[PDB]
C-alpha cells in the first residue's frame, strides 16, 4: 500500500498532444505517488518511442487494447485521446478490464463523449465495472475557483443577486490555423464552443455557487459558415474553409438556489473571460486571458477593490497537477468511492459529474432547436 499508483496511459505521446503537456509533467513531479507502467497506441512503434524519449523505466508498450486493458500491472487507466474516439475505445476497454482485479480508477478527459447517448452508455458501463471514475474538469481545482467558492460559501459577498458571463473560445471566429485538424470544426465530434469553452465555464459556475440550473434558454449560431485560413505569421492565405460548429452562443438561465438570473454570451474570437457575480454585500469578478488568471473583489464615503493574483502559477499544468494530487491523497489517506463530487471541496469530479454536464449541454442544444425555455432542474437526479 506504500506503493505508487501504477498508471496505464492511452493517448500519452511524447511528440504531440494534450497529455504530454499536462498529465505527464504532473506525474513527473509526483513520482513518489504515481508511476506509468503501461502505454497503448494503435501504432506500437509510437508507444515504444515515447517510453524511450521519456525514459519510462517501468513502462510496457502493449500492442492491443485487449492486452492493455487486461494487464494487472495497472491501478489507474487514463484516457487522453480525441473525443470522437472515447466511446469506441472505452466500451471495449471496460469489458477487457474485467481481467484486471487491481484496476481501481478510470480517468477520462473532457469531453466524455460526442453525445449524451454515448456518455450515458459510458457511465452505465463504468458503474457496472465498479471502478472509481474521474473526469478532467480541472477548473474545479483552480486556486481562483476555490477561493471564489469559499468567499461565496462563507457569505462574504451576501446573496447572489445576478450573474453575467462573457467568453471567447477557440478558433471559432473568422480565422482558422492552416495546420489544424478538420474534425474539430465538424459538428458532432465532441469539440466546440458549447461543449468545451462553455462546458468548462458553466461547470465551474455551478461549482462556485453550489447550485444547478432550473430553467434555461439558449440560442446557438453559425453566422460564420466559411472561415479564413491563416499562416503562422497571422496573415490570411486567401483561402476559405467550411465550419459547421458554432461561432456564437447566447445563454440565459436561473440557478435553483435563490432563483438567480444568469446572462451569458460566448463568442468565437481570440478578453478571454469575465465572470461577474453580484452579491448583496459585495461584487466578485473572475477574469482570464479560458483558464482563470485573476479574481477581483469589490466593496464599500469610500470604495474598495481587492485583487487576488498568484504569481508564477501555470494554470494549464497546475490545475491538472492539482487533480492528480487529490487522486493521490484519495488513494492513500481516506467512503471507498463516491457517486460524484457535486459541490464538495474535497475529492475530484467524476464521470457522474461529467454526465450531468453533458445533460446540460444537450439541453442547450435542445432549447435552441425547440425554441423554448426548458426545465433542467432534474438533470442532477436522472436522465434528461
Amino acid at each position: 500500500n506504500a506503493a505508487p499508483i501504477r498508471v496505464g496511459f492511452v493517448g500519452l505521446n511524447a511528440a504531440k498532444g494534450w497529455a504530454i503537456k499536462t498529465h505527464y509533467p504532473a506525474i513527473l513531479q509526483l513520482s513518489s505517488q504515481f508511476q506509468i507502467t503501461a502505454l497503448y497506441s494503435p501504432k506500437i512503434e509510437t508507444s515504444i518511442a515515447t517510453i524511450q524519449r521519456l525514459k519510462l523505466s517501468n513502462a510496457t508498450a502493449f500492442p492491443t487494447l485487449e492486452s492493455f486493458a487486461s494487464s494487472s500491472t495497472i491501478d489507474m487507466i487514463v484516457i487522453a485521446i480525441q473525443v470522437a474516439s472515447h466511446y469506441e475505445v472505452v466500451m471495449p476497454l471496460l469489458e477487457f478490464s474485467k481481467n484486471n482485479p487491481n484496476l481501481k480508477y478510470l480517468f477520462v478527459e473532457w469531453a466524455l463523449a460526442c453525445s449524451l447517448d454515448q456518455a450515458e452508455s459510458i457511465y452505465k458501463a463504468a458503474a457496472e465495472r465498479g471502478v472509481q471514475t474521474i473526469i478532467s474538469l480541472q477548473g474545479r481545482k483552480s486556486p481562483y475557483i476555490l477561493r471564489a467558492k469559499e468567499l461565496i460559501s462563507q457569505g462574504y459577498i451576501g446573496d447572489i443577486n445576478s450573474i453575467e458571463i462573457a467568453g471567447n473560445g477557440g478558433w471559432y471566429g473568422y480565422e482558422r490555423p492552416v495546420k489544424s485538424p478538420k474534425y474539430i470544426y465538424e459538428i458532432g465530434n465532441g469539440v466546440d464552443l458549447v461543449t468545451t469553452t462553455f462546458g468548462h465555464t458553466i461547470d465551474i459556475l455551478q461549482y462556485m455557487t453550489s447550485s444547478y440550473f432550473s430553467r434555461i434558454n439558449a440560442m446557438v449560431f453559425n453566422n460564420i459558415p466559411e472561415q479564413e485560413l491563416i499562416d503562422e505569421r497571422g496573415n490570411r492565405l486567401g483561402q476559405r474553409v467550411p465550419k459547421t460548429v458554432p461561432d456564437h452562443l447566447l445563454f440565459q438561465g436561473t440557478l435553483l438556489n435563490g432563483n438567480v438570473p444568469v446572462s451569458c454570451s460566448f463568442k468565437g474570437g481570440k478578453k478571454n473571460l469575465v465572470i461577474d457575480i453580484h452579491g448583496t454585500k459585495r461584487d466578485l469578478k473572475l477574469e482570464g486571458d479560458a483558464e482563470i488568471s485573476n479574481l477581483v473583489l469589490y466593496y464599500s464615503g469610500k470604495e474598495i477593490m481587492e485583487v487576488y493574483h498568484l504569481r508564477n502559477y501555470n494554470a494549464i499544468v497546475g490545475n491538472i497537477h492539482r487533480l492528480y494530487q487529490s487522486i493521490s491523497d484519495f488513494h492513500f489517506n481516506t467512503p471507498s468511492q463516491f457517486v460524484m463530487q457535486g459541490f464538495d471541496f474535497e475529492g475530484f469530479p467524476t464521470l457522474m459529474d461529467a454526465l450531468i454536464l453533458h445533460r446540460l449541454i444537450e439541453s442547450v442544444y435542445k432549447s435552441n432547436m425547440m425554441g423554448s425555455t426548458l426545465n433542467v432542474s432534474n438533470i442532477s437526479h436522472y436522465s434528461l
Binding site: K16, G17, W18, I20, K21, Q82, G170, W171, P177, K179, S180, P181, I184, V191, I230, D231, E232, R233, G234, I316
Partner: peptide, 9 residues
C-alpha cells in the same frame, strides 16, 4: 502564437 496549440482540443 497564432497556431493551433494542443490546448485547442
Amino acid at each position: 502564437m497564432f497556431n493551433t496549440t494542443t490546448m485547442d482540443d
